[PDB]
Amino acid sequence: KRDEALFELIALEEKRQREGLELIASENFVSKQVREAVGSVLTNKYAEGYPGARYYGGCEVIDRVESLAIERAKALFGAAWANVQPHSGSQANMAVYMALMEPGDTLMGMDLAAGGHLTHGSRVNFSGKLYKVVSYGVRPDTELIDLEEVRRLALEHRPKVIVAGASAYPRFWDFKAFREIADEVGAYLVVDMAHFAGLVAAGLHPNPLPYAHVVTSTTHKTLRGPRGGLILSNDPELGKRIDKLIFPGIQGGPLEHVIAGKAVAFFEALQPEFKEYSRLVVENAKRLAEELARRGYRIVTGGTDNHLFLVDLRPKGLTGKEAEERLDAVGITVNKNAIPFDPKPPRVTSGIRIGTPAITTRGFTPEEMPLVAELIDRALLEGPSEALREEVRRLALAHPMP
Amino acid sequence: KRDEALFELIALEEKRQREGLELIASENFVSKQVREAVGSVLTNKYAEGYPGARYYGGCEVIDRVESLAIERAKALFGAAWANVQPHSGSQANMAVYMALMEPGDTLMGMDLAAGGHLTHGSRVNFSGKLYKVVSYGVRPDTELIDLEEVRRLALEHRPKVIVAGASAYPRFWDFKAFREIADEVGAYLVVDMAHFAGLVAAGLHPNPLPYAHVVTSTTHKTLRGPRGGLILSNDPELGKRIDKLIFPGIQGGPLEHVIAGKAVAFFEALQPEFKEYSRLVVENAKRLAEELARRGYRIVTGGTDNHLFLVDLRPKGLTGKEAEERLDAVGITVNKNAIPFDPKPPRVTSGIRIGTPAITTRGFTPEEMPLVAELIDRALLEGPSEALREEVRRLALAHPMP
Ligand SMILES: Nc1nc2c(c(=O)[nH]1)N(C=O)[C@@H](CNc1ccc(C(=O)N[C@@H](CCC(=O)O)C(=O)O)cc1)CN2
Numbered sequence: 062k063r064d065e066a067l068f069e070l071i072a073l074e075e076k077r078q079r080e081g082l083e084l085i086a087s088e089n090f091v092s093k094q095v096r097e098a099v100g101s102v103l104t105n106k107y108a109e110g111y112p113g114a115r116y117y118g119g120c121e122v123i124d125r126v127e128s129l130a131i132e133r134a135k136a137l138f139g140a141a142w143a144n145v146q147p148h149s150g151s152q153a154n155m156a157v158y159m160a161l162m163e164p165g166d167t168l169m170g171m172d173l174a175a176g177g178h179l180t181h182g183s184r185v186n187f188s189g190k191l192y193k194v195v196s197y198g199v200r201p202d203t204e205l206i207d208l209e210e211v212r213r214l215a216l217e218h219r220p221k222v223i224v225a226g227a228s229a230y231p232r233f234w235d236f237k238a239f240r241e242i243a244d245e246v247g248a249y250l251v252v253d254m255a256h257f258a259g260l261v262a263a264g265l266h267p268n269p270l271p272y273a274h275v276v277t278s279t280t281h282k283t284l285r286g287p288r289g290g291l292i293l294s295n296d297p298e299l300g301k302r303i304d305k306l307i308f309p310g311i312q313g314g315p316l317e318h319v320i321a322g323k324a325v326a327f328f329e330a331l332q333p334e335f336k337e338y339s340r341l342v343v344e345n346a347k348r349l350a351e352e353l354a355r356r357g358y359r360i361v362t363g364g365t366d367n368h369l370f371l372v373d374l375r376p377k378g379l380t381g382k383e384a385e386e387r388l389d390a391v392g393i394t395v396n397k398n399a400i401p402f403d404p405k406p407p408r409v410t411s412g413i414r415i416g417t418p419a420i421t422t423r424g425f426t427p428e429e430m431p432l433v434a435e436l437i438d439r440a441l442l443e444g445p446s447e448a449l450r451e452e453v454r455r456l457a458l459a460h461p462m463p
Numbered sequence: 464k465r466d467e468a469l470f471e472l473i474a475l476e477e478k479r480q481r482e483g484l485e486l487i488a489s490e491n492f493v494s495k496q497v498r499e500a501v502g503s504v505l506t507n508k509y510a511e512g513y514p515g516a517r518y519y520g521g522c523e524v525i526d527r528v529e530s531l532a533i534e535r536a537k538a539l540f541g542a543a544w545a546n547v548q549p550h551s552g553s554q555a556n557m558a559v560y561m562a563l564m565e566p567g568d569t570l571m572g573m574d575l576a577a578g579g580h581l582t583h584g585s586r587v588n589f590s591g592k593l594y595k596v597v598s599y600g601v602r603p604d605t606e607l608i609d610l611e612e613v614r615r616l617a618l619e620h621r622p623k624v625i626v627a628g629a630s631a632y633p634r635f636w637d638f639k640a641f642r643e644i645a646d647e648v649g650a651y652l653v654v655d656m657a658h659f660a661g662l663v664a665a666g667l668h669p670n671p672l673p674y675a676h677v678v679t680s681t682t683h684k685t686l687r688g689p690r691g692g693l694i695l696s697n698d699p700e701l702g703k704r705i706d707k708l709i710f711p712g713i714q715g716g717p718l719e720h721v722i723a724g725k726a727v728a729f730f731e732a733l734q735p736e737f738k739e740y741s742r743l744v745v746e747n748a749k750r751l752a753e754e755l756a757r758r759g760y761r762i763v764t765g766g767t768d769n770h771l772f773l774v775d776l777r778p779k780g781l782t783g784k785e786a787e788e789r790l791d792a793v794g795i796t797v798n799k800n801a802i803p804f805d806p807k808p809p810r811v812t813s814g815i816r817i818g819t820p821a822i823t824t825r826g827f828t829p830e831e832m833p834l835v836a837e838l839i840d841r842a843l844l845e846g847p848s849e850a851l852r853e854e855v856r857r858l859a860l861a862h863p864m865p
């Protein structure tokens with residue numbers, strides 16, 4: 062008996078995705094073959110352990126799948142070791158923290174208010190419950206990270222681990238300077254590249270591998286793969302330690318159907334067409350930010366080096382919460398985000414975060430960004446209307462999903 | 464470009480699953496419609512938070528999918544609250560422990576060799592690293608749990624959490640007695656029903672929900688659903704606390720395509736056919752154990768009340784690792800497994816574990832178990848041969864796959 066109610070919902074969700082403009086920076090649209098792998102019979106196999114050293118019979122083929130994912134990840138990113146088993150970015154970070162630190166140790170990471178991830182030290186998160194968290198942020202005048210403030214905090218608090226990488230930072234990271242600071246205090250440098258991993262793979266963002274002790278990531282977001290986590294390093298000895306924290310430390314059976322999907326995503330990212338896609342992602346984001354600046358918004362840091370940017374809404378007297386709702390009502394999804402010099406509180410904010418990976422996957426090009434900018438502006442100033450919702454729909458339907 | 468090498472490996476795994484006898488007790492074969500949901504576009508949405516309380520917009524349809532999974536889980540097990548976001552059985556247990564305990568608190572669980580799971584207090588697992596662990600076992604003569612030994616231990620060590628449930632215990636649990644013991648020391652009773660969740664849903668195993676404070680489970684064993692975790696409780700105030708430990712405590716975005724698969728599996732488990740399937744699972748396991756006993760194999764506790772059994776291979780001079788390899792060579796997939804008081808470490812073991820869920824899904828009946836027992840016996844005594852493999856293959860191919 063088919064579950065009609067459930068599949069009626071899936072068809073509605075497919076329609077919602079086709080007919081809207083997805084501008085949330087951490088979203089993307091996976092290919093059909095990534096979905097085919099994730100929907101495969103590989104979910105039926107228990108395969109605890111690692112290739113050639115499993116706790117169950119029958120893993121001969123699974124071992125070739127997981128080894129293929131590992132070797133492709135190492136070739137794509139220039140790594141000496143990889144672990145493709147983390148269920149999510151959260152589990153990847155948790156395993157690294159538990160391998161390098163003991164409860165009570167100090168963790169330094171980017172403040173949630175300035176763009177950090179929950180996993181970089183939130184007190185509601187495991188990172189803030191097991192460890193002592195010290196946070197860094199951005200300067201109000203530069204709207205950028207201050208490496209001298211980072212170093213000062215590191216010398217004063219002596220973290221065991223310093224995390225670089227964030228969720229809403231629109232400029233390049235200086236991984237070399239972060240590693241120098243870490244070395245000065247004897248800390249490990251962990252880079253969480255989840256947001257910009259696809260740009261690293263395409264050569265459009267500095268690669269953290271050579272400077273970090275360990276690199277964590279999701280396989281979704283700019284890498285355009287299935288939902289899951291990833292760990293990389295140039296140190297196989299440290300990798301062996303982390304392998305043990307993933308299993309038997311924090312996980313049980315790996316999701317080998319999702320790992321097959323990671324293998325597919327790494328194959329796609331190794332093709333030359335991926336570099337072109339990634340170039341367009343960054344060109345779209347720079348062009349869309351410029352077009353909104355021309356229409357009266359201020360762009361934080363004045364622009365972006367990557368796939369996302371932050372819009373200061375104060376010139377138009379809007380809060381991030383109101384802009385979110387007005388845009389959601391016409392099928393444009395963004396999220397509110399604090400700006401560095403923000404007069405409003407966290408639940409309201411004076412900004413929004415926009416990202417181009419998902420619309421770029423649907424074939425949007427830089428010459429269409431003026432039109433996207435005008436729809437956003439109209440929705441913010443005129444508010445939601447049926448005519449505007451129909452224009453978004455038409456535009457969206459004219460750009461196919463994978 | 465299609466990833467031809469990866470899909471060739473998936474086709475090889477499909478063939479391996481169709482042409483062998485999958486007797487791993489923790490595996491099953493999911494239906495086509497479960498795979499269809501897991502391979503859906505719902506992977507493209509970041510749904511941090513809970514239904515009606517998400518961080519990001521655009522979740523109106525996703526919320527109906529998750530609520531449907533939640534409400535079906537409640538109806539299936541008779542629970543007042545459910546959480547369907549855990550990525551795995553291990554994450555479900557982690558969230559529960561962190562909601563009920565601080566690090567350094569005392570956790571009581573079943574010894575691994577006696578049957579307990581890694582997350583029930585193993586030193587190489589987070590459960591044994593973060594908490595002080597006290598373990599109960601089984602009696603050396605009957606290989607059954609002694610409730611008076613469990614009581615003594617609880618009164619002596621005063622655990623904060625007692626865990627009932629196991630990965631390799633073949634008999635029924637007395638959840639009323641475990642709750643009485645927990646109440647005597649003021650402990651929470653947590654039941655991990657991962658292995659026998661489908662038998663509970665079908666009414667063939669005592670239901671822990673009235674007696675446990677919290678129930679954890681996986682969705683992919685006896686329940687025959689996608690790979691993932693589940694938490695249930697009759698206390699909605701305890702559920703609220705646990706919800707916060709799942710997010711933002713230990714996970715980020717949930718896997719909503721997998722949650723759609725969970726909704727489908729719950730729909731299948733609510734059908735009358737699922738009760739007939741589950742009855743045959745247990746009938747097959749009892750008959751196969753009896754047929755191996757008649758050939759001189761020692762069955763731990765003498766038999767089974769559920770879907771699995773353990774074979775003590777010490778009298779036959781075989782380690783569990785050797786038996787697993789011999790059986791695998793002829794297409795019979797089991798896992799080496801620790802037995803009560805095992806002198807050998809988990810990488811070697813003195814036994815094997817066998818379960819019927821997967822072959823029962825393929826339509827194997829009790830009258831076919833004598834033939835299965837014969838093939839197992841021959842591979843252990845006579846060793847692998849080409850003629851034995853072929854016989855296994857024919858028998859397997861005579862049964863369809865979902
Ligand atoms: N009773 C029981 N049987 C079970 C499990 C379990 O948790 N309990 N498993 C649940 O998934 C699987 C076995 N998985 C296991 C993986 C690692 C270790 C363990 O103790 N590993 C050590 C030592 C290895 C050695 O020296 O032999 C380690 O990794 O250091 C035990 C079980 C299948 N059967």
Ligand SMILES: Cc1ncc(COP(=O)(O)O)c(/C=N/CC(=O)O)c1O
Nearest residue numbers: 313314489551552553580629630657
């Ligand atoms: C009681 C119990 N609790 C938790 C888990 C972990 O579930 P995951 O493998 O993390 O999905 C398991 C899995 N056990 C795997 C096996 O038995 O072969 C379990 O038997």
